Nucleic acid binder design. Structure first.
Ligand SMILES: [Mg+2]
Ligand SMILES: [Mg+2]
Ligand SMILES: [Zn+2]
Ligand SMILES: [Zn+2]
Ligand SMILES: [Zn+2]
Ligand SMILES: [Zn+2]
Ligand SMILES: [Zn+2]
Ligand SMILES: [Zn+2]
Ligand SMILES: [Zn+2]
Ligand SMILES: [Zn+2]
Ligand SMILES: [Zn+2]
Ligand SMILES: [Zn+2]
Lengths: 131, 512, 512, 131
RNA sequence: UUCCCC
RNA sequence: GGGAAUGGGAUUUUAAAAUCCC
RNA sequence: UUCCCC
RNA sequence: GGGAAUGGGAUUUUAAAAUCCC
């Protein structure tokens, strides 16, 4: 009964981070020790002619970016745990997230380590230019 | 590609998820999948009211991170922390009528004897987050599980259940160890239940002292030990061992009944936990005492050892001076250390099992009353901490009472007890039928040292030269008090002293 | 319907039996019936090779015959013969291959603690005679019965099984009663199994003494009691009681668990027998003491009763002379008679409810340690055979150890015991934590009577004014031995004596 | 499963004599205390023009005799217990037994109490002319 | 329909 | 596999059925 | 086998 | 009268069956 969601290659890192007090620190430490990134994300087939903004409602990937489904790029949605936001809601779920093609191998880690500039909606240090 | 049962979608909805809401590529619906990727179809809206139960079965805790301790320890390591062992068993209920395919914790039981019933609660993927909420569930079919039917109407919320778990663990373990080792029989559903009340991370320290952190509080983001865990709601960095991985076949009751007749009543979680811990204790300690493994001095162990030494010296000296046996058989003592060197008596030494020394210093003696009753007719036999079926009528015996439980004496297998005093000794169950030829040793003091020297002593059990007078001198008056304290400590610790029936103190009084 | 399952034909032959072979009218074949009778048809020869299994299920032992005792007895007679109670359970197996429709005894268990496994054996109908022979069988289809799966290959022939049953019953009951009472839960399958090893008839006498005959031998038609039953194979004239007929709902474990926690392990025959006897003992004896029912003497009850009174007199007489309290409190005394009338001390009596004593000077006291800690702050207290949660620090206590089983001390409910001396007293489980404020009483003899005169007495425990000199007279030399035997008998019966920690013998030496 | 072969009115006595050491004595003591005899025996239909022998291969009753099946008039065949015969075989089973009409109410008791004449082949005192 | 026993 | 049980009363009509109350 | 609704 | 559901995993053999554990 029921439909499977995950692949065996994610069994360790998702079991680890679902038990930790600080799942972001746990995932960073798992990666630092030679662990492999969370796989099985939802990548979009798109024309790569979009505006290149970080989080959109449509796949808006630039030629230097790849577009993913948001719920697959959130560690807390991936481990089915509480979000550290005060409201408890997700900023990625229900949206499309554009990850640079150099960092597209680990989108879950990228969405943890980076942040979005407010005035342009770009990833800071990746396509953002306001200074 | 193969799939795993962890995080399985148990909901009864036939379709998949939107590409913006699916957590993995397997969750997205087949409308959007194309050439190994996904497509954003403009017309299709995303669901905003779905409630998809997620299966918490199939955790694998085989991570290897530098600062993070491992939950599953080896049995060589668990033997060193036997004082932290807590058996743990969970009963479950099946999700029904809105989701099918996962099991939820219903009754949690521990070797301490407690049972906690929780309402069936699960993790539900929602379009905003994951909601930890009560879900529909039913007890398993089968006669053996019918007693779980009343438990569906008396569960507690999980936020109360984990508070009670932390309180019980701290109350049991604050005077025994600095950690908890969970003794399990099948770690699958045990881990699935531990998801509800266990947190892991790097090693921490208590907020109010320098002890190891064993509990975590979400209401304050603080860590505490067993002494300071009031109001804490999670168990932080616990350890566990799976006994079934030690080569057992069959079920738990089948393997436990091979060695123990005390425990039973399967499919109740606390009883199964008691059976699991009993089986682990049997597999680790009933074989033989391992002198290579030492244990920390938790409390009063040195005082009890000194009290035992003083009591043994006094009673052996008094018996040898009063009755003047020709030969004393120090049965069960591999060492030739005489407790009274100057006694006019010859000494023989034996061992219950052969030691590593092959010299002719000691002789083998597997004592039983049916085979060795007449081998020691003359003299006296010193049965100090040696357990036999029945003692002869000419013995001085010290025997531990396994029914006196304490911090130094833990429950054992088949009615015995595991006594931990710098080493772990498993002692068989106490029976009063082994002392039918003896009598309880009266409390007394004897003095043979010279009487060269604040309330005057007024007790007639002080067999000394100065007692034949107006008052006992303050040297013996305080030494008698010290010996009385030692005797009371020793007999409160669980030690029972027996002597041959013809022992009398009056023969000592003629010595002066 | 006018049919019964007793003597049911379980064979798989579609046709009936010949009129000259069918035992009843319902067993004859349909081809032979005509107008309610049977007509001999030469065209159908009788079968000479058939084997038909016969069901032994559905016995009704409600016969009323003039010279025959009745197997089922009333509850009052069972309360009278509680010393003869043996719980009994049977786990069975189903006939499968050549016959379907009956169950056969597989594992027979008794409250003594034994389980006897028997080869599946039945009564098959042959054209010559009924044959008692092995039949094919399978374990019951259930998970709860899976522990019976190995036992199908581990049974004994019934010749061995019933001889072992008789041996075990005689060795258990020969020093307790002249009969056996079987405590059953559901008597149907129990009676079906009793058919294999129980025979009935008129009352008899043992072939070697005047006792009631309890066993019968088929090798030579002789009858014997428990003491002379060596080699006897059948139980002769047993008695039984069905506990489920006392208004119970649910199964055995659901009713046992409401009152007891020390027994479990359901669907094992010995365990269910123990549970049945425990439930019966709880239902018949744990309410209050009944003095209208009196039990016969089977041993040293008189010596124990005399020794208890002797020790109670001597201990109180010594204690009131040791420290000379102006007032004492006597708690739990059934009647208002002081132990030592000659004492010059104010006796004040307290009890929850006296044994219908006319002297209403006894005050009401439903004692509890947390409630009555300030009730008796001054003066010595007396707790003789009184069971409380905890005793104060100034008491003199006699407490019965329920862990000492004997002919007088039968097992009880929830860890208690049924002490049957002259009446039946149910005593709750012994706890040493009730004696944290006291110490074990030493042995000593005391007397002030004038005396006038094989080794003379040489002991420091004889506190007499005669002993102040260098010798003791023969009168006290005999009375000290009598009191030593009395004290030994009292402590061997299971009684523990506790005194306040300030007690010592030296003050008694100052009473002269 | 199986075929029921006995009536409830026989449940008491058959439970009694099955457990008794001496079933023949137990049956007579059951009768003497007011109990009813064993019912449900097989009764034969014939012309009542037979030889009149006690036990025969074929129904051979006289004018004042009724034939029964021999298995239903033996107490031990009804109680399924050991025959006290020298080899444990049954003499009535496999044969037809002749019961006098006045004694037809209790055919089991008649076969218990009475005996046969070996030189004439019929019941003693109930038709045998040699005495 | 419901319960007990195996 | 074995077995047991399915409450009490009133009224009406032609032992049975129906209705009503508990 | 079990439950919910009428 | 209407309707729903009958858990999880491992191993072996030829998708299915069997065995074992929970
Ligand atoms: Mg369990
Ligand atoms: Mg049973
Ligand atoms: Zn998220
Ligand atoms: Zn910017
Ligand atoms: Zn601390
Ligand atoms: Zn055990
Ligand atoms: Zn001195
Ligand atoms: Zn006898
Ligand atoms: Zn009990
Ligand atoms: Zn005297
Ligand atoms: Zn016969
Ligand atoms: Zn004749």
């Amino acid at each position: 009964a029921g439909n499977a969601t995950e692949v065996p290659a994610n069994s360790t890192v998702l079991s680890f981070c679902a038990f930790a007090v600080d799942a972001a620190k746990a995932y960073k430490d798992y990666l630092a020790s030679g662990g492999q990134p969370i796989t099985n994300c939802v990548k979009m087939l798109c024309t790569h002619t979009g505006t290149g903004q970080a989080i959109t409602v449509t796949p808006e990937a630039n030629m230097d970016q790849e577009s993913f489904g948001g719920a697959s790029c959130c560690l807390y949605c991936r481990c089915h745990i509480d979000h550290p936001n005060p409201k408890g809601f997700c900023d990625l779920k229900g949206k499309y997230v554009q990850i640079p093609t150099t960092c597209a191998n680990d989108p879950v880690g990228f969405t943890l380590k980076n942040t979005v500039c407010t005035v342009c909606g770009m990833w800071k240090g990746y396509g953002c230019s306001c200074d | 590609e193969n799939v795993t049962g962890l995080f399985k979608d148990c909901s009864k909805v036939i379709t998949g998820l939107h590409p913006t809401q699916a957590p993995t590529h397997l969750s997205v619906d087949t409308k959007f999948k194309t050439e190994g990727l996904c497509v954003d179809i403009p017309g299709i809206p995303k669901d905003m009211t779905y409630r998809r139960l997620i299966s918490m079965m199939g955790f694998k805790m085989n991570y290897q991170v530098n600062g993070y301790p491992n939950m599953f320890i080896t049995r060589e390591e668990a033997i060193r922390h036997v004082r932290a062992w807590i058996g743990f068993d969970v009963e479950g209920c099946h999700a029904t009528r809105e989701a099918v395919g996962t099991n939820l914790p219903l009754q949690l039981g521990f070797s301490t004897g407690v049972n906690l019933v929780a309402v069936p609660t699960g993790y539900v993927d929602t379009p905003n987050n994951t909601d930890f909420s009560r879900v529909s569930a039913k007890p398993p079919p089968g006669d053996q599980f019918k007693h779980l039917i009343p438990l569906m109407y008396k569960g507690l919320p999980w936020n109360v259940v984990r508070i009670k778990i932390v309180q019980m663990l701290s109350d049991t373990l604050k005077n025994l160890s600095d950690r908890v080792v969970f003794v399990l029989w099948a770690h699958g559903f045990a881990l699935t239940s531990m998801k509800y009340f266990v947190k892991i991370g790097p090693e921490r320290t208590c907020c109010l002292c320098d002890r190891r952190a064993t509990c975590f509080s979400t209401a304050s983001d603080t860590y505490a030990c067993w002494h300071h865990s009031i109001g804490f709601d999670y168990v932080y960095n616990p350890f566990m061992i799976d006994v079934q991985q030690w080569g057992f076949t069959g079920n738990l009751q089948s393997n436990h009944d091979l060695y123990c007749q005390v425990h039973g009543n399967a499919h109740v979680a606390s009883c199964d936990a008691i059976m699991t811990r009993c089986l682990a204790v049997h597999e680790c300690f009933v074989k033989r005492v391992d002198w290579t493994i030492e244990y920390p001095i938790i409390g009063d162990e040195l005082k009890i050892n000194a009290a035992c030494r003083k009591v043994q010296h006094m009673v052996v000296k008094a018996a040898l001076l009063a009755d003047k046996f020709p030969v004393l058989h120090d049965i069960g003592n591999p060492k030739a250390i005489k407790c009274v060197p100057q006694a006019d008596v010859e000494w023989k030494f034996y061992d219950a099992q052969p030691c590593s020394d092959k010299a002719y210093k000691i002789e083998e003696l597997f004592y039983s009353y049916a085979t060795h009753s007449d081998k020691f007719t003359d003299g006296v036999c010193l049965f100090w901490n040696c357990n036999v079926d029945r003692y002869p009528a000419n013995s001085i015996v010290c025997r531990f009472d396994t029914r006196v439980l304490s911090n130094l004496n833990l429950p054992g297998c088949d009615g015995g007890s595991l006594y931990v005093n710098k080493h772990a000794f498993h002692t068989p169950a106490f029976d009063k039928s082994a002392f039918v030829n003896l009598k309880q040793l009266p409390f007394f003091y004897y003095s043979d040292s010279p009487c060269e020297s604040y309330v005057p002593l007024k007790s007639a059990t002080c067999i000394t030269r100065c007692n034949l007078g107006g008052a006992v001198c303050r040297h013996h008056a305080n030494e008698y008090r010290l010996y009385l304290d030692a005797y009371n400590m020793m007999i409160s610790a669980g030690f029972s002293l027996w002597v041959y029936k013809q022992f009398d103190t009056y023969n000592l009084w003629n010595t002066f």
